[PDB]
């Protein structure tokens, strides 16, 4: 409703030109629409003039033989005005719609290329909300606000030019309501704004109390807080009762006021008009005509202001969208290389990394994983063992030091070839809203409907898969919401298999998994990990006991390194981290 503050557009004309180049290919079509509004708006100010003339040429001198010629001219004038309202709307509908249809390709494609960090930093819900709203804002202004503003201008100027060339005294009389309108509109809109926001403040508070007390209802009951929460609600609710009244009042009185100003316009035109008529200065039709313009200086003025602010707002929205489309995208090196068929040796050389560049996350990390080796990464929450996964996939780049697969530095390998050779199963697995088969095939487009079965057979997933309602073509609605979590991780394991990577990065949760699937998934991991180098964020005793190398982490620093029995024999931090668990 009421705007908070005017948009701080960083040189709008620059982003205006940019926006004015999107609809550039349909210039002729946009000119054709612009003459329509002109002739549809001008024709619409002619109508009340003709009625006055008709009154003056047919009705007053009792010349009703001229009536059919006048009614035909009006009738066709009407026909044309409504036929151009269809046109200049039907055309702008698709034109505007195509414009944003593009903007959606561009923004979405920008999303595929934009660095992960942008997604990692801002809460997903907000980026979709702001972007979409910014986009509608364009759409509504390009498809509506621009023509309604312009049409209003030609209409306003039209009705004014004709008024003065008919009678000047009467013109100054009716146009005396304009100062009244503006004064009223401004005073009222100032209070509407003040109480809209004071209301929105309390309403947002009251709704917060409602959303947190319903979601945490159980905690309120266990703590017998019903009375206290009732009190906290009441004081805010009683505060909303009083403010809403004020907000709803001031947002409500402008229409009666505008309608009053209309009635005053109607009166003055009828008094002064009729008085001038007695003095033979104007005619009766002239009064009829000025009646016809008597509401053209209240709401249509307000429309002009509001449409202008909407246009102004749309430029800010265009500016944000253009900044997103200007963000830098991930690109390979000019000399980036495809991955030669190697068994995947991994090395970190004195690497340092941080997300905010202020709070160090990884320090001096150095190790060497040779082909076929099962490596366990252990440590408390903050060890940074979850960050290693990102760097090796190059979702983020290292600050200091160098990471390298098969000797070759990771920043000089094609991002395309890297992410194939290296596979990944995360603790927070992500399935899509397609069938089971389409999810498993995701890792390999050219996978047959026999290899999907065969591989699923090998990882103990195929069992429950066919036991599902629609079997293999079961549309996993809401990202596998109706699946056993173990079954989801089993599907995740199965689809990671089909991508045939030569390096595997695992993180398999244990939280709410039933023991039955649990045996199956760790069997599936084994078939997954065989023939592959496997860096595991281990959670299971049978993987740390069977690891070829364990890298104990703490504060983003490698404290220890060695095999299980050795690291227990050392009785260091790994001892505490282990014996205080499986002791």
């Amino acid at each position: 409703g009421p705007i908070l503050e005017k948009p701080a557009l960083k040189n709008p004309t620059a982003t205006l030109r940019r926006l004015l180049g999107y609809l550039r290919p349909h210039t002729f079509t946009l000119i054709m629409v612009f003459v329509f509004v002109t002739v549809s708006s001008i024709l619409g100010v002619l109508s009340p003039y003709l009625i006055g003339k008709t009154i003056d040429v047919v009705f007053v001198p009792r010349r009703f033989d001229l009536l059919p010629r006048y009614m035909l001219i009006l009738g066709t004038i009407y026909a044309l005005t409504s036929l151009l309202f269809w046109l200049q709307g039907k055309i702008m509908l698709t034109l505007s719609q195509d414009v944003v249809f593009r903007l959606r390709k561009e923004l979405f494609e920008k999303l595929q290329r934009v660095p992960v960090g942008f997604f990692d930093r801002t809460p997903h819900g907000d980026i979709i909300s702001r972007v979409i709203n910014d986009v509608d804002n364009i759409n509504n202004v390009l498809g509506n606000s621009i023509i309604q503003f312009f049409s209003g201008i030609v209409t306003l100027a039209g009705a004014v030019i004709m008024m003065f060339r008919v009678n000047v005294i009467l013109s100054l009389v009716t146009l005396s309501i304009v100062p009244l309108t503006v004064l009223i509109t401004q005073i009222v809109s100032s209070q509407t704004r003040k109480y809209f926001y004071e209301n929105q403040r309390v309403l947002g508070q009251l709704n917060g109390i409602i959303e947190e007390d319903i979601s945490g209802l159980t905690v309120i009951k266990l703590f017998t807080r019903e009375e206290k929460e009732m009190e906290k609600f009441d004081r805010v609710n009683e505060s909303l009762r009083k403010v809403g009244t004020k907000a709803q009042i001031f947002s409500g009185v402008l229409p009666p006021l505008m309608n009053m100003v209309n009635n005053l316009g109607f009166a003055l035109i009828s008094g002064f008009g009729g008085w001038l008529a007695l003095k033979d200065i104007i005619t009766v039709g002239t009064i009829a005509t000025f009646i016809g313009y008597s509401r053209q200086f209240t709401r249509p003025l307000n429309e002009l202001s509001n449409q202008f602010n909407m246009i102004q707002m749309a430029l800010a929205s265009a500016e944000r969208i253009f900044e997103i489309l200007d963000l830098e995208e991930e690109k390979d090196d000019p000399d980036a290389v495809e991955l030669r068929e190697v068994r995947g040796e991994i090395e970190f050389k004195n690497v340092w990394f941080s997300y905010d560049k202020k709070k160090p996350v990884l320090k001096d990390i150095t190790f060497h994983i040779k082909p076929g080796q099962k490596v366990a990464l252990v440590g408390p929450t903050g060890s940074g063992k979850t960050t290693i996964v990102n760097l090796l996939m190059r979702f983020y780049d290292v600050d200091r030091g160098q990471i390298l697969v098969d000797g070759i530095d990771i920043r000089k390998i094609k991002r395309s070839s890297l992410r194939s050779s290296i596979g990944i199963v995360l603790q927070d697995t992500i399935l899509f809203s397609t069938t089971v088969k389409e999810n498993l095939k995701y890792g390999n487009p050219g996978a047959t409907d026999e290899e999907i079965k065969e591989a699923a057979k090998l990882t103990h997933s195929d069992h429950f898969i066919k036991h599902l309602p629609e079997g293999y073509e079961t549309v996993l609605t809401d990202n596998g919401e109706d699946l056993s979590q173990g079954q989801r991780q089993l599907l995740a394991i199965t689809r990671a298999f089909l991508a045939n990577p030569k390096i595997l990065i695992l993180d398999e949760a244990t939280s709410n998994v039933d023991t039955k699937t649990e045996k199956s998934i760790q069997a599936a991991m084994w078939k997954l990990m065989e023939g592959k180098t496997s860096i595991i964020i281990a959670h299971r005793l049978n993987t740390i006991k069977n690891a070829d190398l364990i890298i104990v982490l703490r504060d983003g620093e490698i404290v220890e390194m060695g095999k299980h029995d050795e690291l227990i024999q050392k009785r260091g931090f790994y001892y505490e981290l282990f014996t205080s668990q499986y002791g």
Binding site: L67, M71, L74, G89, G216, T224, M260, F395, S433
Partner: protein
Amino acid sequence: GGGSKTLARYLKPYWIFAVLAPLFMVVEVICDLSQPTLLARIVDEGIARGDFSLVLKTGILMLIVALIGAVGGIGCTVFASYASQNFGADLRRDLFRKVLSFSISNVNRFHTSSLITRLTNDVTQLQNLVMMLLRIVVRAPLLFVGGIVMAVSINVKLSSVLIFLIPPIVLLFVWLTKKGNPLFRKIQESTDEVNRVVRENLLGVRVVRAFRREEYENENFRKANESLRRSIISAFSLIVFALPLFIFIVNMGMIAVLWFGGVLVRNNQMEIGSIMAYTNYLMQIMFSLMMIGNILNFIVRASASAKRVLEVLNEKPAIEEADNALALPNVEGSVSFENVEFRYFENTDPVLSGVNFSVKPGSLVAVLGETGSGKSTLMNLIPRLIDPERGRVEVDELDVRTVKLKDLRGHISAVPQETVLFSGTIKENLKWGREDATDDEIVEAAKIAQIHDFIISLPEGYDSRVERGGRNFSGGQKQRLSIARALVKKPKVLILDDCTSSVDPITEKRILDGLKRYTKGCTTFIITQKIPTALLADKILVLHEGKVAGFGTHKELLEHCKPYREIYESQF
């Protein structure tokens, strides 16, 4: 069945506002209908008759009629504001009081999300509905009916025009609504699909990127994009044809007024002024009929709100304290189940069945089982948040259905896996168990909970700020904060879930060890799925698929209890 509760009781006490709003609005309507009759009088009886008084006097009169009509409006809006806002406040309050009485059984009937939208949005729609009823619902139909009344009184015969003008418009509105509704529904479907593809491509960007399959998502987005372009282009192509056709009919109607009225002035039946007012009336009838078209649309949606709000008002709370419930000034903390059969939804299978166990006061019992075993119902049954279908739950050998709820829950602390804090400070939250708790006592509790050092590192320490729901603290921080919040309450029974945050660092073991020092005079259930966690407990309640499998120590359970053996195999 259903309920006799009614939302017309929330408007009832402000009935005076409810009568002055529409009354004041008729004054605006009458004054608005006065104007064209007075104009016609200026010309048919003033101008055409040569007298200036007439013109001057009715001219002065029209101004007064405009100032008066203006009051009626502002009046209507003042009163309708009060009537609606008070209605809203009173409705909202009763809605909230209702939910604060609800049990888990109630909340599960609706959804917590839906319950939120009923006490927020749905309230504001009815508030608006009431505003609407007291103003344009009075304004529009009177202008329509009145305009027709005026038209007819001016010249009955010419009014036949309206019979040809109103049916085509009404039919236009019917056809639009009938053919429009499916298409706008189609828009919301395509809009959603656009949101589906953007959301999944954000939440799963790490997967689609690692799978070198980004172009497939461009292909996917295109389809959702091209669909949104069509469903919108088609829906609105109607609208963009609807409005101009309406204007024409209105226009062509005025053609019918001049023409038909033309023969009537030639035949000395209508003055020219009357023809002029007739146009001004014709337009009041048409544009008001359009407002009526709009009112109807809001009523039907607003009506759905009335139903949802009413379901909440009519819902009876599933957990009732008895009339002569037993006060519990203290509790020792013995806890038993006697043939408990439990199930959250009457559709599904029993979550528990024939569960028999007893726990002497002070025991530290690990309740071990896998997901779906029913181990997590304990937290809900012991304090009376649900009642069993069959069997009884007892605390201190008393059926919990017999004791006062405030007393019972006042002695039991439950720490669920998913924690919820409330806006305010960490101290305010931590004091939820007892206002009169000293800072030393809070620090003691936080220290056991292993969260005191984190709190103390924050700039404002304990008086540091907790945002809505506790959304600004991590998962493990909220969990410990919730553990500390429990300890301050001084529970005589303590039910803790998920062991601790699923594979929490070694410091998980400290909280366990630290509780053991505290659980002196506290019966403590720790619902884990972890063997090591269950090993810190005096005794293990093993649950498999709803029935109790075993109940003893590791050496006993590793012998007989087959589920326990199966669990132990998976973990070692």
